[PDB]
PDB file of C-alpha atoms in Angstrom:
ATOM      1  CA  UNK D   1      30.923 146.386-125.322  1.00 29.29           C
ATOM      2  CA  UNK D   2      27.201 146.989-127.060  1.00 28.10           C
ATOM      3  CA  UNK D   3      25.142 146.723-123.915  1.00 28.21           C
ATOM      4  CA  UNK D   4      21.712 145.603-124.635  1.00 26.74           C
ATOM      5  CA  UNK D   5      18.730 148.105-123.390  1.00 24.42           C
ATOM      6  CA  UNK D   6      17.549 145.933-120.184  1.00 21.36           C
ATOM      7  CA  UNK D   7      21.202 145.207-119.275  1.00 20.16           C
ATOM      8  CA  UNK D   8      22.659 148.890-119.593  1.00 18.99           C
ATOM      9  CA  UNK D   9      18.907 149.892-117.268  1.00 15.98           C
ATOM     10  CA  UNK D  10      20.379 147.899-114.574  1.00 16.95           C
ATOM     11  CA  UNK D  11      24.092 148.963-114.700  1.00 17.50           C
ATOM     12  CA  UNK D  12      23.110 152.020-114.679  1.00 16.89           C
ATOM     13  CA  UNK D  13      20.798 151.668-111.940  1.00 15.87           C
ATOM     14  CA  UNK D  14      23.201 149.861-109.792  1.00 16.29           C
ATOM     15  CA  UNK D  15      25.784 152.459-110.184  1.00 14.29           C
ATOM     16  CA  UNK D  16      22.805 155.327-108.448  1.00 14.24           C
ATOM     17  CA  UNK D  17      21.671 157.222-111.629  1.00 13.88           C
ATOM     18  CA  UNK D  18      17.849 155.953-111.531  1.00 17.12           C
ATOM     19  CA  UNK D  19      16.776 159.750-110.550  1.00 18.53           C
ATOM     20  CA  UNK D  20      20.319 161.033-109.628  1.00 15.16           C
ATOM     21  CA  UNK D  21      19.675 165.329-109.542  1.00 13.64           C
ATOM     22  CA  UNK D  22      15.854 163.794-110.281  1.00 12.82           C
ATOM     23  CA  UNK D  23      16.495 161.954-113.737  1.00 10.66           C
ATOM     24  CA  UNK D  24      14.106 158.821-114.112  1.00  7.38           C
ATOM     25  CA  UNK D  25      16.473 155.941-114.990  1.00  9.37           C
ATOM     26  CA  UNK D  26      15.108 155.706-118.748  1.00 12.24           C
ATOM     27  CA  UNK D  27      16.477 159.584-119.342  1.00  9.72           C
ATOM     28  CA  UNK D  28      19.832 157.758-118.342  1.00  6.86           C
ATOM     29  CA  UNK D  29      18.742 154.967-121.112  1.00  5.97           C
ATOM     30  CA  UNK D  30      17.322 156.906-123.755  1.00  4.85           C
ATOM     31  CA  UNK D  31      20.622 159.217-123.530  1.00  5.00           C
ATOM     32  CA  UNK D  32      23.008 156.456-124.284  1.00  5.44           C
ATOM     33  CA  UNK D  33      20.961 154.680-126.935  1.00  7.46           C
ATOM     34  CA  UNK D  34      21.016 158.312-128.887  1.00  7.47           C
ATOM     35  CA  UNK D  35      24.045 159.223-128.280  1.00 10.60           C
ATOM     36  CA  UNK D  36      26.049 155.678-128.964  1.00 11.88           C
ATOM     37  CA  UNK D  37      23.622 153.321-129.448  1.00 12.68           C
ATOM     38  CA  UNK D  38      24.568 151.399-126.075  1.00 11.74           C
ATOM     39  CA  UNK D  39      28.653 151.056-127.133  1.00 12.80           C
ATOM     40  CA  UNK D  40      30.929 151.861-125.032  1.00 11.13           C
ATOM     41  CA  UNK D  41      33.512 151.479-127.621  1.00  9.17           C
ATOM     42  CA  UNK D  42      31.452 154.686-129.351  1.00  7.24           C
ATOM     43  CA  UNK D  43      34.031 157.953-130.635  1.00  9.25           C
ATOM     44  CA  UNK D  44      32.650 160.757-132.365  1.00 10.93           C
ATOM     45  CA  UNK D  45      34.743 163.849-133.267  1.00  9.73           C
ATOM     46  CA  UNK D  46      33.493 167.194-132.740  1.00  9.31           C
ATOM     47  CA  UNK D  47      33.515 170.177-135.015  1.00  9.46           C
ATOM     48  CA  UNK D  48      35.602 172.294-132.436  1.00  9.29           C
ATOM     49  CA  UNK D  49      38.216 169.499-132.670  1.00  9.13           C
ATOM     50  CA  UNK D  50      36.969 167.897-129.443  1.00  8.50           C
ATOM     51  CA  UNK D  51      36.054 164.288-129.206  1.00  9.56           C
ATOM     52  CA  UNK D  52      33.130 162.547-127.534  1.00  8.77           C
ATOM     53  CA  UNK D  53      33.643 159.019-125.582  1.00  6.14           C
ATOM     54  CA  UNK D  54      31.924 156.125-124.526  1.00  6.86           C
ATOM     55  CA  UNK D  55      28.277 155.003-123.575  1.00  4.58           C
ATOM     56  CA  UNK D  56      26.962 158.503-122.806  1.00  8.42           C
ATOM     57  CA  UNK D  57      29.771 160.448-125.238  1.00  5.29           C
ATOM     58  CA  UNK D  58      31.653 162.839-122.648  1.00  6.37           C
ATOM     59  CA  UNK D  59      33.634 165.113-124.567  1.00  5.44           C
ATOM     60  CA  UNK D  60      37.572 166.094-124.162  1.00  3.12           C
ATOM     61  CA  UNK D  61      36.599 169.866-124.001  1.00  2.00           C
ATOM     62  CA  UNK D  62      35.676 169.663-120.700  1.00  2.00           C
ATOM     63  CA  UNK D  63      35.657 166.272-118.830  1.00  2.00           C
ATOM     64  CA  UNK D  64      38.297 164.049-119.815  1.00  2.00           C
ATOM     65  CA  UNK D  65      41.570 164.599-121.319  1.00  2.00           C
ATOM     66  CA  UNK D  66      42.727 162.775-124.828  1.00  2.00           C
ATOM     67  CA  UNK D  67      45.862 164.185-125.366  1.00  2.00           C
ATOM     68  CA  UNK D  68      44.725 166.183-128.374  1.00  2.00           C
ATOM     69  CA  UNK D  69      42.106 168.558-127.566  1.00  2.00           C
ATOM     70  CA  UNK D  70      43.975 172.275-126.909  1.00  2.00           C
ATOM     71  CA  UNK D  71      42.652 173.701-124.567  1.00  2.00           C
ATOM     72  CA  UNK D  72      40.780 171.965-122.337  1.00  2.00           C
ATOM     73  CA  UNK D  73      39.917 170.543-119.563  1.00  2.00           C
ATOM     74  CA  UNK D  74      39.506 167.428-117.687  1.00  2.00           C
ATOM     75  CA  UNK D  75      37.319 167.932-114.784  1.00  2.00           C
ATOM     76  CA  UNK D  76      36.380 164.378-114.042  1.00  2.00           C
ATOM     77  CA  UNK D  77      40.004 163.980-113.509  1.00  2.00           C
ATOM     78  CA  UNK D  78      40.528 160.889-116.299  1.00  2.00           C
ATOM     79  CA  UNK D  79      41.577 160.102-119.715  1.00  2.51           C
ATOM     80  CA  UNK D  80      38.896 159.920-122.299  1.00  2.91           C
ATOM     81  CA  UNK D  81      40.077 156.197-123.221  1.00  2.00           C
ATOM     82  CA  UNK D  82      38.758 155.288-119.980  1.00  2.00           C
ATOM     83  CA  UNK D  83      35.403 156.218-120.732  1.00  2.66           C
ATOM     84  CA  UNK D  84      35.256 153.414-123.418  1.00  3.14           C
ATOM     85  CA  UNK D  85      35.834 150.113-121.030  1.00  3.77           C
ATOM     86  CA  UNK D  86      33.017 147.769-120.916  1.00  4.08           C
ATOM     87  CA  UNK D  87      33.410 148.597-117.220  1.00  2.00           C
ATOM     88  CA  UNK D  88      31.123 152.180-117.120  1.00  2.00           C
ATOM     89  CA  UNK D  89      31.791 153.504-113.628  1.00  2.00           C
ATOM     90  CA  UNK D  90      33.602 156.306-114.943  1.00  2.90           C
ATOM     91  CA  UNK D  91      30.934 156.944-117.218  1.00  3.74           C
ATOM     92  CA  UNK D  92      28.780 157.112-115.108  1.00  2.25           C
ATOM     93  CA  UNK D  93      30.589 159.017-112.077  1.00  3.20           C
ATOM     94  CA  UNK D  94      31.319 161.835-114.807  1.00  4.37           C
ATOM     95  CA  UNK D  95      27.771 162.069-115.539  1.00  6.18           C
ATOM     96  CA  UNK D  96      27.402 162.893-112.309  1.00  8.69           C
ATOM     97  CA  UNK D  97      29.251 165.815-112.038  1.00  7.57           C
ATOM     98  CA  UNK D  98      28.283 166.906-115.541  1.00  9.59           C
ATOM     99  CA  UNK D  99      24.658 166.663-114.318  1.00  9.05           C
ATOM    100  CA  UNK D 100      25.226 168.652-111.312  1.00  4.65           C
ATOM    101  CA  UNK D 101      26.650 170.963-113.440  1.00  3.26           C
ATOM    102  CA  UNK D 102      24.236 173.956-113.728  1.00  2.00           C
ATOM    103  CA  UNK D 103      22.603 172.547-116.949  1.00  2.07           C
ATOM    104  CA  UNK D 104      21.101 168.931-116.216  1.00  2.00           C
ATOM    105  CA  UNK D 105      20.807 166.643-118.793  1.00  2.00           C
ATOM    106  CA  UNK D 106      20.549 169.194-121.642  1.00  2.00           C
ATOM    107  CA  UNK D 107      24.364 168.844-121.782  1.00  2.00           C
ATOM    108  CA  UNK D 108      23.088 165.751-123.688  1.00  2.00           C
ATOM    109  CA  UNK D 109      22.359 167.333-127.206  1.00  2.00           C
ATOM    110  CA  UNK D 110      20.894 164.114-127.844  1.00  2.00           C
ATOM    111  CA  UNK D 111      18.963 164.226-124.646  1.00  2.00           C
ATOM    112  CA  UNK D 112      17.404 167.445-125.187  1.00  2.00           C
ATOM    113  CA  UNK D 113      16.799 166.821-129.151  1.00  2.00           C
ATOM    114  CA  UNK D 114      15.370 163.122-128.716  1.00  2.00           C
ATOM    115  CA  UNK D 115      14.608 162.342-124.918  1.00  2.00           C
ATOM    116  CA  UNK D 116      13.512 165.221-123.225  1.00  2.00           C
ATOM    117  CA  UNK D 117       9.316 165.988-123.580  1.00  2.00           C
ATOM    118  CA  UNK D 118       9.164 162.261-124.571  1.00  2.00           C
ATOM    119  CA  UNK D 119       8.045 158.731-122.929  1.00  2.00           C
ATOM    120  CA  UNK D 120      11.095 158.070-121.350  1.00  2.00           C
ATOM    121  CA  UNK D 121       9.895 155.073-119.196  1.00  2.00           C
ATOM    122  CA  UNK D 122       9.527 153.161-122.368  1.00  2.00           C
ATOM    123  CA  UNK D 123      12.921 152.903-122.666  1.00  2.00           C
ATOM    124  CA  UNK D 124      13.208 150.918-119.853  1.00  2.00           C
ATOM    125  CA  UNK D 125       9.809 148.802-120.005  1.00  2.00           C
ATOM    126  CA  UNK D 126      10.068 145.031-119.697  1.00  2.00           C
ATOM    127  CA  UNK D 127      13.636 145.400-117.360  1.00  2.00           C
ATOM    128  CA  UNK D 128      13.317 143.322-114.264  1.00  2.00           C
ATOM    129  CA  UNK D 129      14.997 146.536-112.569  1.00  2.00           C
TER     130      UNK D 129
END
């Protein structure tokens, strides 16, 4: 599914991120838009052989498993493939723990590169939220 910006802001509101560990919901928002552009059906491989999935592209290396990715780990406890359903509680669960993880959101490459230091509430202005 290619959520729209306002509609994502609320799904991910209403599944607790909107300042989860302290994140303003539009880090959350600009995250996903920069990372897949709001779709969940979004798969990008990585150089280490690793894949990235869904809304907020969790990689295999650590977080979910894909069946191809030697090595790793699976610490949300799921396969990658569910990471891509237009449903994005597990999405959004795993970002969770990857939050609480020691790093915060600069686990998001794309977060740190084109989020962090910036206006992040304007990703979410004009959402009835």
């Amino acid at each position: 599914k290619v959520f729209g910006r306002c509609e994502l802001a609320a799904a991910m509101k209403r599944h607790g991120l909107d300042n989860y560990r302290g994140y303003s919901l539009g880090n959350w928002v600009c995250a996903a838009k920069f990372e897949s552009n709001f779709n969940t059906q979004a798969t990008n491989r990585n150089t280490d052989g690793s894949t990235d999935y869904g809304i907020l592209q969790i990689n295999s290396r650590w977080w979910c498993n894909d069946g191809r990715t030697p090595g790793s780990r699976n610490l949300c406890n799921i396969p990658c493939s569910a990471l891509l359903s237009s449903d994005i509680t597990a999405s959004v669960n795993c970002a969770k723990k990857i939050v609480s993880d020691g790093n915060g959101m600069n686990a998001w490459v794309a977060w740190r590169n084109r989020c962090k230091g910036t206006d992040v509430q304007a990703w979410i202005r004009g959402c009835r939220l």
